[PDB]
Amino acid sequence: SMKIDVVTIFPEYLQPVRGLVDVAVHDLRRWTSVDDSPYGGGPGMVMKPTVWGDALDEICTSETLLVVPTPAGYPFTQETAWQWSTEDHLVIACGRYEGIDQRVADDAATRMRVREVSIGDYVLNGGEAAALVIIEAVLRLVPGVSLLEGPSYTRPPSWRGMDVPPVLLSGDHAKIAAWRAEQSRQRTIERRPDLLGFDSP
Amino acid sequence: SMKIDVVTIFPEYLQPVRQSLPGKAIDAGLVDVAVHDLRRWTHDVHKSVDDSPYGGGPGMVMKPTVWGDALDEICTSETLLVVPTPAGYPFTQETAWQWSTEDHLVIACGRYEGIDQRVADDAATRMRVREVSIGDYVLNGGEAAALVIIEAVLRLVPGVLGSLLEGPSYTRPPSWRGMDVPPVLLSGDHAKIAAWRAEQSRQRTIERRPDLL
Numbered sequence: 001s002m003k004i005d006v007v008t009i010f011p012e013y014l015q016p017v018r019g020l021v022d023v024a025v026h027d028l029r030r031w032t033s034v035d036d037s038p039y040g041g042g043p044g045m046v047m048k049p050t051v052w053g054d055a056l057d058e059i060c061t062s063e064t065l066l067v068v069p070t071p072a073g074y075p076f077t078q079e080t081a082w083q084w085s086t087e088d089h090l091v092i093a094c095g096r097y098e099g100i101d102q103r104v105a106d107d108a109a110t111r112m113r114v115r116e117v118s119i120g121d122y123v124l125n126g127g128e129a130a131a132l133v134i135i136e137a138v139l140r141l142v143p144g145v146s147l148l149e150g151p152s153y154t155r156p157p158s159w160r161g162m163d164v165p166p167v168l169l170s171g172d173h174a175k176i177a178a179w180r181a182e183q184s185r186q187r188t189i190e191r192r193p194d195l196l197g198f199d200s201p
Numbered sequence: 202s203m204k205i206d207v208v209t210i211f212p213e214y215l216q217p218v219r220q221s222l223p224g225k226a227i228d229a230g231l232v233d234v235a236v237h238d239l240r241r242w243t244h245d246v247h248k249s250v251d252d253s254p255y256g257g258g259p260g261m262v263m264k265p266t267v268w269g270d271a272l273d274e275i276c277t278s279e280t281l282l283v284v285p286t287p288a289g290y291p292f293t294q295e296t297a298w299q300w301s302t303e304d305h306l307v308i309a310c311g312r313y314e315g316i317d318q319r320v321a322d323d324a325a326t327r328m329r330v331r332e333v334s335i336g337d338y339v340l341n342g343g344e345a346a347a348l349v350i351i352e353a354v355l356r357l358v359p360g361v362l363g364s365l366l367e368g369p370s371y372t373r374p375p376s377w378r379g380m381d382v383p384p385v386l387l388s389g390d391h392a393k394i395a396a397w398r399a400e401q402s403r404q405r406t407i408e409r410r411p412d413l414l
């Protein structure tokens with residue numbers, strides 16, 4: 001059983017989320033201008049801590065795992081997803097602009113567990129798409145719901161003059177298992193050599 | 202000026218992308234994102250998109266004949282075909298920069314155990330195909346990855362959407378719940394501020410992403 005609360009100034013972006021789990025989306029502006037120029041200078045705007053503090057006060061408890069997407073976060077991995085899959089309560093704080101005043105996470109950490117995470121090494125305009133990814137990766141692991149996958153095939157056995165690998169039609173479990181291992185190994189070496197402890201291209 | 206076509210059995214999942222697009226960019230003809238229901242290209246009254254995996258195993262595999270027809274209609278020789286997959290090459294910021302100058306992206310979103318490999322292999326004989334993963338976690342299908350790719354790519358297209366880690370940011374008020382903004386930021390010593398931010402970045406990268414060093 002899990003409850004997920006998502007806080008965002010763009011609640012409409014979280015629509016694609018639509019009994020063991022409830023997901024609720026909250027408009028941050030309900031607790032109010034949410035942004036201002038950064039202290040110390042720099043381009044863009046920073047979300048003010050005041051509005052966030054009030055929102056999180058209401059939504060979070062000491063048992064909450066507060067998730068804060070950020071391009072500067074610890075990596076969110078499958079291990080993270082497994083870890084979070086047994087939590088009772090995730091709150092995902094989605095910001096925009098140049099980010100959220102750091103004191104929001106710092107203040108929250110005095111009261112609950114806080115995880116600043118990034119879903120990958122690319123830049124988004126805000127946390128919402130990251131929230132969608134995190135929710136999907138976590139929810140599919142909730143109780144009651146290494147190497148790269150090799151290629152998959154289905155009918156027909158010949159299509160546009162391209163044949164399904166004959167071993168897959170042979171019914172030889174051992175040969176099929178071995179061919180699939182080899183395919184995964186070749187794929188991992190080519191595409192993700194880091195997973196096998198080699199240099200990245 | 203970019204056209205993105207997304208093909209999916211859950212077109213409603215992609216609706217927020219068309220929400221995030223500013224009218225000015227669309228009206229200036231800088232961007233067009235169209236979403237297509239894969240079932241438009243099914244052959245049978247049951248609108249089947251999947252079938253059992255050759256060689257056995259759990260789950261199902263998306264049918265090559267359905268995808269083949271969809272991509273035949275939507276793609277041209279100039280298309281960059283993007284296929285999200287947990288077995289893909291990593292999608293990075295460098296990838297996003299590269300793709301941001303493309304005329305036509307087609308994103309093929311699958312489900313279940315994947316799309317019959319012959320779809321991408323056949324497509325690759327007449328267009329550029331890119332199998333990519335957005336990170337080291339497992340999703341149920343390509344749709345959430347497509348959302349991420351679209352956003353990361355389009356924000357690099359001039360006026361469409363509107364290394365070390367970045368350190369912390371602060372704004373008003375100067376004191377909040379017992380926490381003061383670091384005084385250096387209010388010092389007016391901008392060389393010192395830059396050095397402070399550099400050191401914050403270094404420390405954060407060591408703590409959170411040692412792999413980057």
Ligand SMILES: N#Cc1c(N)n[nH]c1-c1ccc2c(Cl)cn(Cc3cccnc3)c2c1
Nearest residue numbers: 069070095096118119120122124125126130
């Ligand atoms: N998780 C993740 C993640 C990812 N993997 N990329 N971008 C994001 C993400 C997460 C949270 C925010 C917030 Cl709050 C504002 N922005 C825009 C921004 C901020 C600083 C520098 N550049 C862009 C966010 C980007």
Ligand SMILES: N#Cc1c(N)n[nH]c1-c1ccc2c(Cl)cn(Cc3cccnc3)c2c1
Nearest residue numbers: 285286311312334335336339340341342346
């Ligand atoms: N991009 C990315 C990405 C990512 N970073 N995680 N998962 C995905 C993703 C992309 C595409 C598909 C398709 Cl098609 C089916 N599935 C579910 C699946 C397949 C094989 C093994 N397990 C789950 C997909 C998962």
